[PDB]
Design a protein around this nucleic acid. Structure first.
Ligand SMILES: Nc1ncnc2c1ncn2[C@@H]1O[C@H](CSCC[C@H](N)C(=O)O)[C@@H](O)[C@H]1O
Ligand SMILES: Nc1ncnc2c1ncn2[C@@H]1O[C@H](CSCC[C@H](N)C(=O)O)[C@@H](O)[C@H]1O
Ligand code: NA
Ligand code: NA
Lengths: 281, 321, 367, 281
RNA sequence: GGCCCGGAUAGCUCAGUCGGUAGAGCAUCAGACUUUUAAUCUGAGGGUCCAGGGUUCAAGUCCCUGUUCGGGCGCC
RNA sequence: GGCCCGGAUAGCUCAGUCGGUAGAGCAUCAGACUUAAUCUGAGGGUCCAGGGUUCAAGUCCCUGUUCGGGCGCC
């Protein structure tokens, strides 16, 4: 399962194939079915089922392929982007600043594609729980499906409703809240109602800055504290060996060298992360 | 739930922290002051306090020249400086990781708190994992892992010197239920272990055989070579660490190495591309930027960069034949 | 002052650029189109234009939803066919009308957010209402263009980094500057603008000629050339120790270089240069250890390198050598910003690929 | 002088002293003057006058000092901070975006300490000119003094007045404009009236984001086009060789390496820069 | 007589003229060791960088005064 | 025939199960070397088109054009 490692691949699972480069793809397992790839052809009944994760699975014209056990970070990359998602870089920082752990209770909105949602369940297992919200009828159902296909319904509840009006469907039970909606400043009141009376942490993701100015202006009104707006910025390096040729000066020290050059020339902007704390006072 | 004697705790003035242990009549110091920790016991976590002559108490001429927002900035500094309040919070990876980076960064090799979170997520740390670790960051990393596991699973701490350091670890204040899955094994018996060549005066003989016993327990679990992950973050060169320790890992499991500098990991990257049985190598770095957000006076403060070290991550794979 | 024929000019669509010369009856390409530069000569600079069949004509310079909670991706939200769109386009309609038609047939447009509408329109006008502007060349524009278009020609020198080199080197009027670049001569160009012809530049080239394709796009007058000089990179060591020394079409050029090289050779022999800049595909260590001998005491210098590792060696080799101070290994990160109401945020943080810079001053030796 | 190099020191000049580390200081050479340093003392009558820039200058005790020819970038790091200034990082970028060259006519406000004012004069010499503004009496007066002590008054004229209320003191003669004020959106009109009718450039330094939104909104309405908004962030690296020790595994590759670590783990935020273009239309 | 310059953070005391100040020693404590009122070896705990105000829309590249230490010229 | 995969950018054509899909070759042009041949170097890039969607962050699918692979009768 997503929540716990299992040595052997079994039907119904969700496995990740690593083609090569950084390119990958996710697949659901079913007896008799097949999948097509760059390197070759895999038959789900013999090339997969019963083989342990991380095997050089042969396929087609001498082609192989490596298979990986599912994790939230791997799913984040190969899942179907029903919407725009937050990558594991933002997720990591949010997961820590909200003080998440096994046995915690969380409220998310919007659910969206379930990139964030899967990263949460992983940590809060096996006694924690989630009460995600999504006012879009389809994405709501489609998420519930993925949660069932992945076998994680025990630790999640999808509530098809608005958050800025109906709240998270709960009250005085949540340890942490996360927001990834266009207008989070209107859900601040319900975030307080949702959070435990004993206290909790808060987080609001917003691409624009006025969204922050309004969110903070609303958080202060409700009585949150320890406001701090952070912004994480990843930077991956393509490793490569290079050699600058010497200059011809008429002469007859200039040794090669390794280096880590960035991948994209310029790093994109995910969004501003605003955190806060609820304390009894 | 409620505060109690003996429990470990963190303090907070504004954005400054320091961790201590609650002991009856144990004087301490904090921001140039000096307290006693006796009166704090019977309150809830998150309670504020003001210094008094002795023990803590728990409560509930050209000024007008400055503008509306400059006058509020002038007051806030001169009131906070003379009247400063001290809160009490329950420990957490968040608070300690920010604290140690600000109070004792040299001890933890400048691992910025944002960089730490990436390792917790990239290594897929969760309940029901057999993890391997080798760190010299005062057990801060060891504490972080434990928090995300919650007693479920196990951890094997490799150490050099006399014994494993776990100073910051204690500040978390974990129950006794978590030490069950905690073991140790000296680092100078690994090459022996890989080859399979591994093997009041009374107070010592009891502490000695009891520990060496615990070492052979770890030596077996390591010998299984079926870990669910590896983490590394020390003051040593990481290249050789992986080339030996990764053999203890099972295929299709994540690993994450930290390094205050980049050049060692560039050597470690090639030494892995040559080795075999790994994929999706990812030499990454994370920059963080905090902000100041007030109406009509909203601007970025700091851009914390470069000092956050570098990370080399990936997953394992079987070897050919 | 005003645009004319034969001029050197830059084009601009949205944030895409390309340099071209105005030639009478000259066909050119730009973002998958075909132009003729005859019909754009008389206007002033900074003039917008629209394409038709070849000639460039000069143009002029509500019900909205709230949430996407009930916006499903059918594909049949737009109600005209992929062949109909071609029918209107081939018809030669203005384009302003095309956009207006699409909005009418979009069944969802009147239910989208006011920003999604403003975004949806900006997405169409970018494609149909192809407004191309014309601009006069400058160190500003060309540097951005090259980095965005041909970064591999200038060793990935980001324009912000370039701006630093001009400042750290104290580039100005009345300086005997030395340069060794392989960035299409762009570096030589950025200098000459900040010199305005005054002073002199001593360029050092590898192979058999200094690259000046970029330098041409500035369109500097001939007066700036009287102060320019060149000198091949292979005889530099011979110049340190004083070991330096259609047939007529060959004689002239071979005699012009000689007649122009001996001049350059002298100005270097004086060893009284007011500064040095370096930015090439070659290792920077040896380039410094020799060329610095040609610089007077107390003058600035700057060296560029796409990678960091080489300058670390320079940093150390310059201490063994001595006679320098204020060594400062620097990188400049650049972050642009989109700035609309309730719609303000960064777009791209240009980092790492902008290269690095080593800067300092010269000093007398110990003897 | 500032504008033009000179091999020998002379009285009235403003030289710079390297004290080692990054620490330096600006000094005006007068006959009979002294200056105390951590290395000893300099007597200007013999230790400076008549001998060339960049010379090894002893200081009585045996200690010595290196003297440097003056430049705007060096003045920026040793001038008397009357008000907060822009540093060579921010400046260098602006100089290029405004297309400043020898002959360029320029306007500035405020003048403040005159960190920027010197950088401008340098490039635009010897044919260009500047028209600055400073509605404070003292800082305006002090600026005039410095420009005359540096012998650069030829290329500058100061005006004591409010720019937002009385303009830059000229009309349609300037190739470019710059602003460092708490309310640059009020001077947008006068800026247009100052810049040549043929066209020109514009700039505004304002670290609060709210100030930027107003400026851009005011600019476009006036007729300005080609708006953009940049922020530069320097990052300096200390070169220090290091060696990570190897771990003991019982074994009776670990090669050291050069490296460049950042001087500041945290870089401060100067301000947001906001450019634009004027065109007949 | 004055004047000028340069430093204060660990319980104490120190870190240079490559832009070398989050680095360390004394003390302390714990292992290891043997020489046991304990030494030695190896490690660990301990860091927000003095006070008091001002200028600057904004200072994490800044000024003035005080406490304290050091350096250097000389009755100006 | 159907189904599932993977790519189109320089005038043309390529880019690897981690040694660059911003990297190059051809052609072209220029120097260098001579008997139009032969070496070196330079100019030349915004990613095939159209539509619908994500937050107001390019992030994803569909359709169409074209090149090629794979399963083998659904
Ligand atoms: N008021 C509201 N209540 C509940 N969901 C909302 C909402 N407003 C917007 N949303 C939902 O929020 C989603 C944001 S996309 C978020 C993706 C998600 N955070 C992830 O990375 O996994 C959208 O799909 C939208 O349907
Ligand atoms: N409305 C106004 N008109 C003219 N000057 C103004 C002004 N508002 C503020 N100022 C002046 O602008 C100055 C800004 S400090 C600017 C520093 C300068 N740009 C540099 O870096 O060199 C202040 O000293 C203030 O006196
Ligand atoms: Na002290
Ligand atoms: Na092609």
């Amino acid at each position: 399962s997503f929540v716990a490692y299992e040595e052997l691949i079994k039907e119904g699972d969700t496995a990740i194939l690593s083609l090569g480069h950084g390119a990958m793809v996710a697949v659901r397992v079913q007896r008799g079915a097949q999948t097509q790839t760059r390197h070759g052809v895999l038959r789900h009944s013999v090339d997969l089922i019963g083989r342990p994760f991380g095997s050089k699975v042969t396929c087609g014209r001498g082609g192989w392929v490596y298979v990986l056990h599912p994790t939230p970070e791997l799913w984040t990359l190969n899942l179907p982007h029903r919407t725009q998602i937050l990558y594991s870089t933002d997720i990591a920082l949010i997961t820590m600043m909200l003080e998440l752990r096994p046995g915690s209770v969380v409220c998310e909105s919007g659910t969206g594609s379930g990139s964030v949602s899967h990263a949460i369940i992983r940590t809060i297992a096996p006694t924690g729980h989630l009460h995600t919200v999504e006012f879009h009828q389809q994405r709501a159902e489609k998420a519930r499906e993925e949660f069932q296909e992945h076998r994680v319904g025990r630790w999640v509840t999808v509530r098809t409703q608005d958050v800025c009006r109906s709240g998270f469907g709960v009250s005085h039970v949540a340890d942490a809240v996360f927001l990834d909606i266009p207008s989070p400043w209107e859900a601040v009141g319900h975030a307080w109602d949702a959070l435990k009376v004993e206290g909790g942490r808060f987080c609001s993701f917003s691409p624009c800055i006025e969204q922050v100015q309004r969110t903070c202006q609303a958080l202060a009104a409700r009585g949150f504290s320890e406001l701090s707006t952070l912004e994480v910025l990843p930077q991956v390096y393509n490793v490569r060996t290079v050699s600058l040729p010497p200059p011809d000066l008429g002469t007859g020290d200039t040794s090669p060298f390794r280096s880590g050059t960035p991948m994209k020339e310029a790093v994109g902007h995910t969004g501003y992360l605003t955190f806060a704390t609820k304390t009894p006072g | 739930h409620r505060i109690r004697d003996g429990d470990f705790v963190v303090l907070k003035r504004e954005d400054v922290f320091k961790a201590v242990q609650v002991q009856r009549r144990k004087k301490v110091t904090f921001e140039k002051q000096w307290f006693y920790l006796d009166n704090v016991i019977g309150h809830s976590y998150g309670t504020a306090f003001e210094v008094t002559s002795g023990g803590s108490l728990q409560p509930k001429t050209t000024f007008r020249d400055k503008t509306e927002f400059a006058q509020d900035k002038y007051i806030k500094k001169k009131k906070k400086k003379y009247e400063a309040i001290i809160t009490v919070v329950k420990p957490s990876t968040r608070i300690l990781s920010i604290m140690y980076y600000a109070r004792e960064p040299g001890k933890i090799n400048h691992m910025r708190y944002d960089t730490l979170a990436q390792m917790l997520t990239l290594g897929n740390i969760r309940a029901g994992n057999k993890m391997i670790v080798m760190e010299t960051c005062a057990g801060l990393v060891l504490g972080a892992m434990m928090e995300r596991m919650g007693g479920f699973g196990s951890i094997i701490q490799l150490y050099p010197g006399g014994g494993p350091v776990r100073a910051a670890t204690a500040c978390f204040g974990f129950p006794k239920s978590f030490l069950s899955g905690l073991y140790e094994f000296p680092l100078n018996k690994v090459d022996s272990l890989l080859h399979g060549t591994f093997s009041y005066i009374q107070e010592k003989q009891r502490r000695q055989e009891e520990q060496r016993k615990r070492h052979l327990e770890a030596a077996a679990l390591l010998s299984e070579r079926n870990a669910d992950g590896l983490i590394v973050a020390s003051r040593f060169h990481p290249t050789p660490l992986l080339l030996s320790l990764l053999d203890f890992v099972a295929p299709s499991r994540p690993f994450v190495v930290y390094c205050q500098y980049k050049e060692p990991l560039l050597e470690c990257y090639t030494k892995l591309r040559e080795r075999g049985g790994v994929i999706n190598l990812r030499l990454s770095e994370t920059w963080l930027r905090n902000y100041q957000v007030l109406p009509d006076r909203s601007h970025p403060k700091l851009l914390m960069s470069g000092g956050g070290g570098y990370l080399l991550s990936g997953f394992t794979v079987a070897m050919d034949n």
